[PDB]
Amino acid sequence: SQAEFDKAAEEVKHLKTKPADEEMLFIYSHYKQATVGDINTERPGMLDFKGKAKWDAWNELKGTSKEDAMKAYIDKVEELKKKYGI
């Protein structure tokens, strides 16, 4: 059906600690691409400060091989799972 990806996701979005913007970004961007696809949300407007980046990082992908997005997402999440975990 699926791999460990939604798992990676599921875990990461809960984590004891809330990952740094970039950690969240990688995850986010890739998940969003692997799942939703091509940043179809749009770039921020009000308290942009800690949002933009997520937008941009996902955007940066906008068309990556979804599968890769998953692989990568998990393949990298490990760090979060080792640093933050549930």
Q: Is 84 one of the annotated binding-site residues? A: no
Q: Is 50 one of the annotated binding-site residues? A: yes
Considering only CA atoms, give the Rg of the chain: 12
The technique by which this structure was obtained is NMR
Q: Is 28 one of the annotated binding-site residues? A: yes
Distance CA 67, CA 84 (A): 25
- CATH for 63: 1.20.80.10
Distance CA 55, CA 62 (A): 11
Domain span holding position 60: 1-86
Phi, psi of 84 (to 5 degrees): -110, -55
Considering only CA atoms, which of 12, 47, 49, 46 is closest in space to residue 29? 12
Number of domains in the chain: 1
Q: Is 13 one of the annotated binding-site residues? A: yes
**Which tokens in the block code for residue 71?**
């692989």
Q: Is 66 one of the annotated binding-site residues? A: no
